[PDB]
Scaffold this active site. Structure first.
Site, mmCIF file in Angstrom:
data_model
loop_
_atom_site.group_PDB
_atom_site.id
_atom_site.type_symbol
_atom_site.label_atom_id
_atom_site.label_comp_id
_atom_site.label_asym_id
_atom_site.label_seq_id
_atom_site.Cartn_x
_atom_site.Cartn_y
_atom_site.Cartn_z
ATOM 1 N NE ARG B 59 -2.980 0.430 3.225
ATOM 2 C CZ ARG B 59 -2.495 0.853 4.390
ATOM 3 N NH1 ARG B 59 -2.060 2.100 4.527
ATOM 4 N NH2 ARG B 59 -2.445 0.019 5.419
ATOM 5 C CE1 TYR B 112 -15.381 9.152 -17.436
ATOM 6 C CE2 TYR B 112 -15.192 9.298 -15.054
ATOM 7 C CZ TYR B 112 -15.417 8.555 -16.192
ATOM 8 O OH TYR B 112 -15.674 7.206 -16.087
ATOM 9 C CG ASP B 184 -8.473 13.879 -16.627
ATOM 10 O OD1 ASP B 184 -7.705 13.189 -17.315
ATOM 11 O OD2 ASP B 184 -9.535 13.429 -16.148
ATOM 12 C CE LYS B 209 -11.504 5.552 -19.327
ATOM 13 N NZ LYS B 209 -11.897 6.982 -19.125
HETATM 14 C C1 LIG Z 1 -19.233 5.716 -15.528
HETATM 15 S S1 LIG Z 1 -19.167 4.129 -16.328
HETATM 16 C C2 LIG Z 1 -17.622 4.296 -17.297
HETATM 17 C C3 LIG Z 1 -17.689 5.387 -18.362
HETATM 18 C C4 LIG Z 1 -16.372 5.452 -19.144
HETATM 19 N N1 LIG Z 1 -15.252 5.766 -18.241
HETATM 20 P P1 LIG Z 1 -16.470 6.696 -20.496
HETATM 21 O O1 LIG Z 1 -17.246 6.128 -21.624
HETATM 22 O O2 LIG Z 1 -14.935 6.914 -20.932
HETATM 23 C C1 LIG Z 2 1.521 0.786 7.654
HETATM 24 S S1 LIG Z 2 2.622 -0.342 6.832
HETATM 25 C C2 LIG Z 2 1.678 -1.904 6.967
HETATM 26 C C3 LIG Z 2 1.475 -2.368 8.406
HETATM 27 C C4 LIG Z 2 0.698 -3.690 8.438
HETATM 28 N N1 LIG Z 2 -0.629 -3.521 7.824
HETATM 29 P P1 LIG Z 2 0.529 -4.313 10.161
HETATM 30 O O1 LIG Z 2 1.811 -4.924 10.585
HETATM 31 O O2 LIG Z 2 -0.615 -5.442 10.053
#
Ligand SMILES: CSCC[C@H](N)[PH](=O)O
Ligand SMILES: CSCC[C@H](N)[PH](=O)O
Ligand SMILES: CSCC[C@H](N)[PH](=O)O
Ligand SMILES: CSCC[C@H](N)[PH](=O)O
Lengths: 396, 396, 396, 396
Positions: B59, B112, B184, B209
């Site tokens: 993460r 969008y 964007d 995209k």
């Molecule tokens: C909100 S459903 C998804 C819509 C597509 N992103 P758009 O056609 O690029």
């Molecule tokens: C904030 S870095 C990740 C820490 C682990 N989720 P924790 O040891 O379960």
């Protein structure tokens, strides 16, 4: 039949899943797609109006992820599920869907560090205030409730010493005052604890831990009433966090959860053996594990949990330096954060994650200098015990 | 050498990537892991304090995703990148990192749909107000700025008629008033437009995209200054949205972006041919494409964009029913939302996505009854043209 | 330490694996690459001469697949492993590496159908003759041996009635006559049987079954002496079958095998309960399961196997039509070929796979009209039993 | 319509693929499954008898892999395709399906090294003799044909100097004598050469190279008449090599081949520029590239190939030591075996792969001490040229 009618192991294997309709493929296909094709303008219109079942776009929903969501809804005895990019995203998608400027949350203090960061620093900057209390004392929860309180938030067992929170009692208190109860059930998994059956309204998990169980997925899940999940999906996820789960991640999590029952049984059997070993060791001052009769809330644990879990915290004699020596002396246990993997993981917060933190700040969070957290894996317990014994002896 | 010194195609292929250090593997390995193991307590502490390079938890960061982030930073000429679970998550992680209760945003109106939903309904509920303006008129942007304005937000080209926004001019206006400019750049990709080189502070993409380009990844990316990206990572993503990208998704996006240059060249060559065909067709009232000299902002396009893009919108004679008939008559173009796939995609908002919307509400958003949006793929342009000709003729 | 020194569950989890050297990633990275880059001409030369450790090209070897190979070598107590595209490829790569025109093989008759096809029809067309015998009678093996016999080939337990072959006795007979013994250990996995420890020279598996265990990988593995595996790799696989395993498949198999111990324990516990239920059912004429004391080779099973396995065959009263009725009446068990999945699988060869076969031809292969094969999964055994009871009662 | 009716780029994108029938998913789902479930005993029987369409088991066939097989059949203008675990497996599955003890093969000498190993050492040990000839001289092919010759085998362009073989002429010679012609079309891809249209009976590819194109898949494909492919599938693959392709590998190859047209155009445009640069360089004695008018078979190339390819071989002044110095001096080109990746790859056989080989043995294979092979990637050609110029100058 109906998958909600089978035994829990049968549900773990089968719920939310079916052979592929077009091919009969047994494994849920990996629908690793961004978009979906309509057969006509009319079919497209029907789906956007919600007058028709079917898919549109993976951020909104996906067949692989839907299987995971349905499975977890079955396992938690909730109406519906919503998969997310991370455990954190499950929590924040939930709370940002429910709360707006002027609202209030009562939260346990003994919670996941990053959750604490979100609640203490981010929420207030959006005009959402949070009161932190000791949730092991349901009266502190009551006392902190305000007219604007929308949510009570708890984790059980809690970090870092695996204290408990009485879900049923807290649910009753929250509901009397018109608030929802949200429970983070990550440490237990649905195999060991079922907060919705005890009165909670919403359950969240980091599936990164036991549900996936294989140390290769970051992800979260939210389970609750259909009406809430629909809002969490079509507002919280779609507009606010954008925290959707990759179909590949959902497929891996489906695959990992197949063995949830047998994994949890072994994790907990191993953990109890290790906890008992530690409790008898003269170099270990304290052992925190719900399965030990010396646990301050043992009886609550027996009522609320089907197994005592796979996590143990313990304090080693000699404080900071002993903890450091011990963790540098293990040969089998792996030094890492996270938990719920098939491998035994170990960490010493005071010399590792919380090194940068002031000693008095650590103490207020329940982190003593000798505190070690162990995520017990699927290895032979004799091997883990021998590794711990070796490292503890060297350190002390 | 330094990848920032090579030609743009060379960068597309090589930037941010290197053979694996341990094995020499040419493909970036898929580091599909949740956690990372330390060799000692000391190594763990050093990384949590940020006194040491290395990984901790997916993460927070991951080697596969880091490669993607670095590549996109190079391609946009920004300092750093941050990958996310979706385009929406790139936008909201950015804006929720920058803004708090009491702050203000000036946004283009031609944006969008889901972004519009976040800005119009969600932000204000967190105490962050948004003024929507016609960003094709930089003076409207200036007029809407307030002492509390932190951010100006634009997309170019814009939905649904591919109008443009003068990035350099708007950047100057934002900066004079002490605001950041967020752009964007999804429709263009870095191959066709480089907002940071024109004065923008932050660029966001849905990699769903063109960057990925293969219709099999939902994902986003944020590029900007290191100091901002560090906050977006360690606060926005870590605590607020939790919108991290799966390593597998990052790997697919790395793989897809390898062909970005050759894909964009072909998309745009095909689109120009199709746009010219449509412009000459007596059943087509209007064609919106930056590459046609009849485009109201053609000259701005020539200054700001290296290619005219792969998207075309057009209006068919006979309004709603003709659009429906036409889209139900194509045999090669696929009826779907999204864009930037290798397959040609087509949609008719008035009979599909926006069917549930009131006709006057659609008009205010620039969506006329006969408006069709076409994402031009990599097929032979003669085949796409023949399919369109067939469907248009049948419909009109 | 050395992974060969730990308990078997510890080995299942850890053997052949280590955190990534460059990053510390806990999960074995997916090295989904075709080629590998050298730092110099000299490094390339050293590797092609085999004067240097390192990788060259995935058909020759790959870090992800190497981890799987090493793990399985540890679990079978063999020197080295070689992963393949399928179980069939493990068998044919082995036999085509060992045998040439003029050579002879003595094979059990009660073997996997496709193996039988290879041995009876393909081998002889390459000038390699095969004698088929009843391997439950070691004397038939001896009697069939010739001066040109290079290999004795057996499976145990065997299809379709789970008869056994005495590995240690057959190994001694083969070796006395200067032949190698190859054992297909697919049905047992290394958790339940270790042919190399009983004197076999080479073990093969379809990892498609229990080793992977998740019904989502086709693959094989070969384990044996380093000198043999080197030939199987650099001649058999490289030149002859080309049957290399995809790194992704190796990664999934590594992931699946993590739970091998707990899966096999549950498969076998469930199977014993179901077998005992079937043995007591008046509509069931015969039950073939090594764990029943009525098994003709029960004692050999107790000496050679640590658990009785997860597969059961049984005969239903009423022959062909009853078997068809029964299999069409199950609601939980899934009608499919294959075995060793987390889901319970069921098949009725006489009405399904072997429908196209003459009744007398089926009988010679040990397939009676009422014979059903059941691969017992991880569901609650009460649920499987109830499903079987329901279907059996309806059918009879 | 029928995908066989569209332009070649349209076919590259669309042939063999369709939105998922159950969901409309645009990306071909990854059917990463081992087995398939039947709705009844009857459905199972029908499929095993081949009285019914549908799947049974991934080694036999799989929906993802079927899409790849159908696409490649369309692109080569063949009736059917068969995917395999590797290019080698495509070749050996083909030849082992066609040939038995006593049969004979006439093969080009200028072929892939591992193919040469299979033909020269393995085939004869199965009683299948092979005569090697110079296939650039069709008369040598005729002269080597025998009453037992079943197959003529060729590659074009050939290793290492990209000599050509006249497919149409050789096909006529083979057919007059009642033999099949098998052509390895790996170097060209169907975009640049179509052996079946010139009279070949069977085409094989390593998809590891251009068809996949992304350096992350080992795999092969066979294309030919339905009757042959059925035998290659149900005998060659099922029983003999077991060389099936993983559904994930098939999905990656489908994904990679989407850009085949635009990739080949760029590879070849870049290669021609680089070849012309090399031809003008006084330190380069020879340049082997079909696109140079000095190529000995230039005219044949113009008739048989649509583009001159992405591979160049060249000889550097100063032989072995110069080649070593040069390859150790490149900064952008990557030292690796394989070809057809998006990255430019370079190798010097005399100092690398063939270092362990005697100098006179190398010469007989057409490998001189100064011979370098270059796989031209998608980078800016100016960057590759500058890298080569730098390295060549330093070396000479
Ligand atoms: C909100 S459903 C998804 C819509 C597509 N992103 P758009 O056609 O690029
Ligand atoms: C904030 S870095 C990740 C820490 C682990 N989720 P924790 O040891 O379960
Ligand atoms: C020949 S099709 C596949 C048959 C399975 N391997 P059997 O049911 O284990
Ligand atoms: C025998 S190792 C692999 C060699 C590559 N296939 P060649 O460089 O195309």
């Amino acid at each position: 039949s109906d998958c909600r009618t089978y035994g829990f192991n049968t549900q773990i294997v089968h719920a939310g899943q079916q052979p592929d309709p077009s091919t009969g493929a047994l494994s849920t296909p990996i629908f690793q797609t961004s978009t979906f094709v309509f057969d006509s303008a009319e079919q497209g219109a029907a789906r956007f109006a919600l007058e028709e079942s079917g898919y549109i776009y993976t951020r909104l929903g996906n067949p692989t992820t839907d299987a995971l969501e349905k499975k977890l809804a079955v396992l938690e005895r909730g109406e519906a599920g919503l998969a997310t990019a991370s455990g954190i995203s499950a929590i924040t998608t939930t709370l940002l869907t429910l709360c707006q400027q002027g609202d209030h949350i009562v939260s346990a203090s003994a919670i996941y560090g990053c959750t604490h960061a979100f609640l203490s620093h981010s929420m207030p900057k959006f005009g959402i205030n949070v009161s932190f209390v000791d949730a092991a004392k349901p009266e502190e929860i009551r006392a902190a409730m305000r007219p604007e309180t929308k949510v009570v938030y708890i984790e059980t067992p809690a970090n870092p010493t695996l204290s408990l929170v009485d879900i049923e009692t807290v649910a009753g208190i929250a509901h009397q005052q018109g608030a929802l109860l949200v429970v983070d059930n990550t440490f237990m998994s649905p195999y060991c604890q079922q907060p919705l059956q005890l009165g909670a309204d919403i359950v969240v998990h980091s599936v990164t831990k036991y549900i996936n169980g294989h140390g290769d997925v970051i992800g979260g899940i939210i389970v609750g009433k259909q009406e809430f999940i629909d809002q969490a999906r079509f507002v919280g996820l779609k507009d606010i966090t954008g925290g959707c789960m990759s179909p590949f991640n959902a497929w891996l999590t489906l695959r990992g959860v197949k063995t949830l029952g047998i994994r949890m049984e072994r994790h907990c059997e191993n953990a109890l053996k290790i906890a008992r070993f530690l409790e008898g060791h003269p170099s270990i001052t304290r052992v925190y594990y719900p399965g030990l009769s010396s646990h301050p809330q043992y009886e609550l644990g027996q009522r609320q949990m089907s197994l005592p879990g796979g996590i143990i915290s313990f304090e080693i004699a000699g404080g900071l330096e002993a903890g450091r020596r011990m963790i540098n002396s293990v040969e089998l246990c792996l030094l890492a954060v996270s938990l719920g993997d098939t491998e035994t993981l170990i960490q010493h917060p005071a010399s590792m994650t919380h090194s940068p933190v002031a000693p008095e700040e650590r103490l207020k969070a329940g982190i003593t200098d000798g505190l070690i957290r162990l995520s017990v894996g699927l290895e032979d317990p004799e091997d883990i015990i021998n590794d711990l014994e070796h490292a503890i002896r060297k350190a002390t």
